[PDB]
From a paper:
NA is a good target for structure-based enzyme inhibitor design because its well-characterized active site is conserved across all influenza A and B viruses. The 11 amino acids in the active site that interact with sialic acid remain unchanged amidst extensive genetic variation in the rest of the sequence; for an alignment, see.
We have determined the crystal structure of 2 in complex with a type A N9 NA to a resolution of 1.55 Å, and we discuss it in terms of the successful reorientation of the benzene ring and the lack of improvement in binding affinity. Structural studies of complexes between several benzoic acid leads and type B NA showed that these inhibitors were bound in the active site in a similar fashion to sialic acid, and the same is observed in the new structure. The carboxylate group of the inhibitor interacts with the guanidinium groups of arginine residues at positions 118, 292, and 371 as seen in all NA substrate and inhibitor complexes and calculated to be energetically important. The other propyl chain that is disordered is exposed to the solvent and therefore not contributing to binding energy because the one interaction seen is of low occupancy and at the upper limit of the distances considered as significant. The benzene ring of 2 is tilted by 8.9° relative to compound 1, increasing the number of contacts as was predicted in the design. Most glycans are flexible and only the first few sugars are seen, but the glycan attached to Asn200 is well resolved due to interaction with the adjacent subunit and is seen to contain GlcNAc2Man7.
Author numbering:
A (entry chain A), B (entry chain A), C (entry chain A), D (entry chain A): 81 to 169, 169A, 170 to 333, 335 to 392, 394 to 412, 412A, 412B, 413 to 468
């Protein structure tokens, strides 16, 4: 009775952002059985949207929260839970086991991907309709890894971006095209992006756009544009001088379209953009040095205009509060003639910036676009670290 | 397969009130993971009735409960949970994010509205079928705010009363008429009510009646009567000398139909009435000074008779116990030829009246009408504050 | 699509009892959020059987557990929860509010009844399909009260036995016949039973048999047999000298069919029997003085034979362990040509017998009949009281 | 609308194993309400796979966890819970009561079997569609007991292996053939296996293969092959010199097909194999002395070749970590032309090996086969015992 979803609509006009979800997980977890997480995201099914993240297999107050600054262990899993509830022991659904993930619904059912293993011997398991269907072994033997936010599907084809290799030099990025959890095709990265991590993707009018993290040399963000019908892609960087990785140098007046904008090496943060002509909005941390603050900037033609500057903006998280990863999603099953852009921001608490506790976790805030020009508030995690001492 | 509900029935004859629900949330939350709340209510779908409230994004025993006397923060959300269970971390569904709300089912699906933001820049998000559909920016830049109990729908049209502006002088009240979460029309307040807050509404025979709080000058309650087909309304005050706001002066022998009954300024409490000729019942606190006690009084023709006094009553909460906000709802999908009036009372515990704890929360008690003349009990919150010290 | 259930089958031959359910609630609640309860029972829907009990509106470890020896408060409610799970804050469904209850499914949906109020002004609320439908005021102004185990329905007619009046003298017992939560008829108690409390009922071949507690004078149990088609009944006592109330005198060699067997006044315990000719089994405590131990005895023709003695038995709970109330239920929707008799035993822990704790609660054990002659085990609550100190 | 499942497919080619599930129960239970368990397994329905285990009727942190090294009590039950979640008080479903179990879905609904009682008087209760249908009394009066992992069905016939009698000498093993919870037939053990415990079974091409534990004399594993259409079986031992019980002597160069391989008496561990010609994989502990480590070895023709040695392998749990019972299951309702072999390993923590705590419990790890040659990781329980002190 269900058909595959097709990306038949364009983006709605984004004139501001409204609050969509917030879980207050760290506040609540100070005195309830909330799992330690990081790398969260949001993804919709045709009848529900849910929060997702990588659990660390312990509660925050639990003694096993000590050491959760670490990224890869056998105790991590992709979990999902109801929108704006916290990720608790009792309400979280485990989608698959591992320390890197993506997930998306194709209109009929959901594909989830988790990678696990030691650094030199990791493998992806691709689940479809809550069953494992395909496995992929590491090709470069160096932390096979993927998006950490939702993938996007079109007529059953769900492309996913993976990287295997160094985070501080050339690596081997591949785009896999899945259908019903099976590999139709894969391609090596093409175009002018020089390094790819942690792609944040969205779809509109039969094209999928991903904004990624050049961890090696670039403080501008690489962009991959995927045609899920032809199963081909292109890549470049956001041309705009409004630089959106972190850490980063100060904004110049002219950016770079086909190479990394230099100044900071071997670091970054997962982030996102919506690239739609004049209707283009970029997210970034406010700090150029650290994962603090978060703002959206309207930067008309950021993708293609190497001198484009902001014409409007919205503060999401004050620079006096911690942010983190951010990513895109949309409710492809909503009513109306256009898709409304959404995003989330991971609000990281604990280590390394707050080292009086022994753990690292996060909460989530999420916003979607409005055609109104709405007033802005800031949305901090809200927990008091001293309470955990 | 579902059609919009129509208000085709009149009210059942109210001869007494029977216990409908009670969650004992503060008792239970002394040793379980119960969220701090305030501004609760009850609302029915065609196949379930649920408790609703504004969470404070912390448990009661949690250290973040300190400071929850405050009304507006980024950590509040409209939550719902099963009838007479407590609002726990693990059983509460987040409907939307914000610090002021309303919600109602139209027979097909549910509309929920949450307002958030700083005082001078708040916005409403109107959700329908669990998706955001419309947003409304503040028009007076002073705590845009709404009912804090359920709205009512008729043939898909669900009117909602909002206020923006001062709580201690003239403000800008609007009635919005929504259908499928979209704005059909709005109107500014008309009639003789001089200030409107926190409307408590019910529907019968194609009319919606709301009893509100005149926070500015009136200790009688303003009333708005809305025709959801014509999308028009009128307003006045309850004429009766049985005054039902709090705090209030002592009852006179003659009330006021078209102006605030004076004596107390710049305060009030959310409350409700059922105004149905001889079948008219008013709720109020027992104390004229504080939110303590709660009683129902049968006051025939209270709406229109400026000398009407009680002919029957029922004590709901003794004056030696704390009460709080109260509001109306009905199960529009019940069997029978008439709609049975129901209400809830918020039983506030903690600050400011019980200041040995650092938190403010509440539990809920709820009653519905009977055509029998039933014996009465009183229904306290039941928690011992000393246990929380 | 569902029709009312009819009692078309006879009882299966009972040759022994097998374990059906057990919740270990007190053990588990020593370190999890388990509600304090008493007066439990079991009742089936067409697609699920559940545990039921009167909550006390606090967890066991909670400070509000102090005082829960008391029977009637505003903090009690009928709750249900999944078979053999414990009654927790997070998995318990509130069916109605009050301190006395019954509940049964008619094949289409469930009727639940809760009574609340002060001793001289109590009222029953009859819920059907999870909505209140009928209310009944106290008729004798002295703790209106009902079965504390499931009722039984036949072609939509669900009789329920109520008592109002003294527990230590003549009282006013009524049988109400409900359909879809509405009163079709009621009758005063007739026959030779002189006092009725806490009836435990089952149905077979279009008749409902209830075994009750004569709290006033009788240590034999009164029996009410109800024809739910004619809506009439009879009553007498179990004739057998195998006395089954508690406390009680020692067993004589000849019982009494039409009067209380004397020796103990003004006390008792809820209990049950299956009265089916040679296929007759009685439950009782092992102790004649206290609620300790529990055994089933096959006593052919106990109902009608005033010299009938046991021919077989099964120990359920050793006399060195606490028991409590017990009652009957069956899964009227099971497969097969006959109905299998089941029962539960309430295993009371805490006050008054274990007074080093300040609370009273219980767990549940439940058995059903087998046509095999199965080996027996004993089934204690299993908690160590010292752990709660 | 559902038909009985038939075993129409063969096994997929097993070239390695991928992570399927892991619950981290002991880590998480250090600070959440996780039930103490042992003897876990996994079993699929047509629309969900779940974890199963025998609860001990207490949480790990609870004071009643003291003494849970013991195997048989009245506080045990078969529980199930969602895949890779932990077995918590609030998310666990009780399937039946007892201290030995099996369970399987026949394509229409699920059969579950639990045994309880004292050692000399135990009985099995066979539940079907969540109702008790058949009971079986002990035949040898010495701990009637069964598989502790899933059974397998074919056209409605679900064979189950039981043992009653000594664990240290000849015993009375029976194969029962159930359909809709009713006994069609049973047979005594035939063939050359000399003692049978704790069979781990799987089905393919209309045959069911079970690998068991010879607790008496054998360090090779007995195998029972059952034809569920003819309702007949055969038995022998795995011929291979790759010995897979524990404890065990060192591997010889030639095994035994029709007798126990000697060297260790009166002990063992539940384990499993997939016996499919060249596509044969055996699981075993790494240690020959204790339940530590776990590895899979590809041993072509292990069943029939008494000199067969490994040609490939995969380490699942390092020898420096505790393992435990292991068993087979498959998702018979997955897509594709073949059934993918899966297994679980019980990771036992606490007593007797870690005796600074007073409890014994476990977590679960589970893997399924891949046709890829995937890299390997090890999968420890992950809890730090010192945290529980
Ligand atoms: C209630 O809520 C509402 C709604 O949210 C609030 O209103 C919002 O207020 C915020 C804050 O002011 C606004 O965001 C800022 O928007 C401006 C862009 O708008 C300005 O510029 C526009 C473009 O002008 C240029 O081009 C036009 C033609 O296209 C031309 O006409 C003009 O002459 C000029 O050449 C103007 O069009 C626009 O005017 C319009 O709107 C006005 C209202 O804002 C109105 O008054 C006008 O009439 C007209 O209608 C307006 O002038 C962004 O520039 C700004 O972002 C910069 O600054 C913030 C800090 O404030 C910074 O964090 C951003 O990153 C960014 O600045 C950095 O990057 C730049 C780009 O590289 C760089 O140049 C800067 O130096 C700076 O760089 C440094 O910091 C970064 C980050 O740390 C670092 O990486 C660098 O290295 C470096 O160190 C904000 O986004 C909203 O747009 C506004 N919304 C609406 C709908 O009005 C309202 O205030 C609330 N009310 C109350 C009472 O609180
Ligand atoms: C078992 O349960 C049952 C059921 O619940 C219990 O029975 C209930 O008992 C309660 C408590 O007594 C009753 O509530 C009160 O009801 C009266 C109204 O009924 C009286 O008056 C009626 C009207 O009489 C006038 O008009 C009629 C014609 O219409 C005329 O005939 C008559 O002469 C007179 O002119 C009478 O009809 C009625 O009689 C009927 O019922 C009697 C039983 O009650 C029965 O005996 C008769 O035969 C007949 O059938 C009866 O006399 C309310 O007036 C009263 O409310 C006032 O008082 C309470 C405190 O008790 C107060 O809190 C209320 O706010 C209110 O008083 C305040 O406001 C007034 C209005 O402005 C003001 O005038 C007062 O001075 C007072 O004001 C002060 O306090 C307020 C609040 O703090 C403050 O704001 C002000 O500023 C100021 O300081 C109660 O609601 C139930 O009706 C009754 N139910 C039933 C079905 O019987 C039963 O008791 C329980 N059993 C046991 C053993 O416990
Ligand atoms: C493995 O599990 C199995 C299955 O559970 C275990 O087997 C079960 O074992 C138990 C315990 O022994 C049995 O329960 C008892 O059953 C007897 C009834 O059976 C006896 O009597 C039958 C009737 O005999 C009379 O009539 C027949 C004709 O109808 C006639 O032939 C005969 O001559 C005589 O006239 C016999 O038919 C029956 O024999 C059959 O079964 C035998 C096996 O049991 C077998 O050996 C035979 O071959 C034959 O097949 C048998 O002799 C009940 O009487 C007994 O209940 C009384 O005693 C218990 C305490 O043990 C007490 O708590 C009960 O309340 C009751 O006694 C009180 O009440 C009486 C009635 O008023 C009174 O007379 C007593 O004085 C006593 O009263 C005192 O205490 C009470 C309570 O505290 C107090 O209120 C009073 O005031 C007073 O102070 C038991 O129910 C099971 O039936 C049996 N099941 C099966 C299937 O075999 C097996 O043991 C386990 N294995 C192991 C190794 O553990
Ligand atoms: C990334 O991940 C990948 C994938 O997991 C990792 O690659 C895996 O690496 C592991 C570990 O090395 C491998 O497992 C071992 O496999 C060998 C079997 O393969 C060897 O032997 C094969 C058979 O050879 C014989 O026959 C062939 C013809 O059939 C003939 O040609 C040959 O001459 C010989 O006669 C070879 O075919 C095979 O070669 C192939 O693969 C090689 C890669 O492995 C490749 O290099 C070749 O080119 C070729 O393609 C290979 O040589 C198992 O033997 C071994 O299991 C034994 O040893 C482990 C300990 O390491 C032990 O725990 C096992 O129990 C077992 O040894 C015990 O039992 C034996 C049987 O009775 C006994 O003989 C031993 O003495 C020993 O007994 C003692 O211990 C036990 C247990 O404690 C005790 O009970 C006894 O009493 C006694 O005390 C392993 O299973 C994987 O197969 C391999 N997978 C793949 C796909 O490559 C990779 O390493 C990872 N990368 C990194 C960087 O980490
Ligand atoms: O009816 C008057 C009062 O009587 C008391 O016994 C009840 O407990 C109160 O709740 C009631 O208000
Ligand atoms: O492959 C051999 C070993 O390599 C290690 O790096 C992995 O962590 C182990 O799990 C593995 O068994
Ligand atoms: O060594 C790092 C590991 O320490 C503990 O196991 C932590 O619980 C785990 O999250 C972390 O990966
Ligand atoms: O400053 C007031 C705030 O303090 C803390 O954050 C409380 O948890 C929050 O409820 C409150 O709004
Ligand atoms: O006074 C007796 C009452 O004390 C406390 O409220 C107990 O929590 C309650 O159960 C009991 O009814
Ligand atoms: O005596 C052993 C028993 O002790 C306690 O009851 C434990 O909680 C239980 O698991 C165990 O069987």
């Amino acid at each position: 009775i269900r058909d595959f979803n097709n990306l038949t609509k364009g983006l709605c006009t984004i004139n501001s952002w409204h609050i969509y979800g917030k879980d207050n997980a760290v506040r609540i977890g100070e005195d309830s059985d909330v799992l330690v997480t990081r790398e969260p995201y949001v993804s919709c099914d045709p009848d529900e949207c849910r929060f997702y993240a990588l659990s660390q297999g312990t509660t925050i107050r639990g003694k096993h929260s000590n050491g959760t600054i670490h990224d890869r262990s056998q105790y991590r899993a992709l979990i999902s839970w109801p929108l704006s509830s916290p990720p608790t022991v009792y309400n979280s659904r485990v989608e698959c086991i591992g320390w890197s993930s993506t997930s998306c619904h194709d209109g009929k059912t959901r594909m989830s991907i988790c990678i696990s293993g030691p650094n030199n011997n990791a493998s992806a398991v691709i689940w479809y309709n809550r069953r494992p269907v395909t496995e992929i072994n590491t090709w470069a033997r160096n932390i096979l890894r993927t998006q950490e936010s939702e993938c996007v599907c079109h007529n059953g084809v769900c492309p996913v971006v993976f990287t295997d290799g160094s985070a501080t030099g050339p690596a081997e990025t591949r785009i896999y095209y899945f259908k019903e959890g099976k590999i139709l095709k894969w391609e090596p990265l093409a175009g002018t992006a020089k390094h790819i991590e942690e792609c944040s993707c969205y779809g509109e009018r039969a094209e999928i756009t991903c904004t990624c993290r050049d961890n090696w040399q670039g403080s501008n963000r690489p962009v991959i544009r995927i045609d899920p019908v032809a199963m081909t892609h292109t890549s470049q960087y956001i041309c705009s001088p409004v630089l959106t990785d972190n850490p980063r140098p100060n904004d110049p007046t002219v950016g770079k379209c086909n190479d990394p904008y230099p100044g900071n090496n071997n670091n970054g943060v997962k982030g996102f953009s919506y690239l739609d002509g004049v209707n283009t909005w970029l997210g970034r941390t406010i700090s150029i040095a650290s994962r603090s603050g978060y703002e959206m900037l309207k930067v008309p033609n950021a993708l293609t205009d190497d001198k484009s500057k902001p014409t409007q903006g919205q503060t999401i998280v004050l620079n006096t509060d911690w942010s983190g990863y951010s990513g895109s999603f949309m409710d492809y099953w909503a009513e109306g003639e256009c898709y409304r852009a959404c995003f989330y921001v991971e609000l990281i608490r604990g280590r390394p910036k707050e080292d009086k506790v022994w753990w690292t976790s996060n909460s989530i805030v999420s916003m979607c676009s409005s055609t109104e020009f709405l007033g802005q508030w800031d949305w901090p995690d809200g927990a008091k670290i001293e309470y955990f001492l």
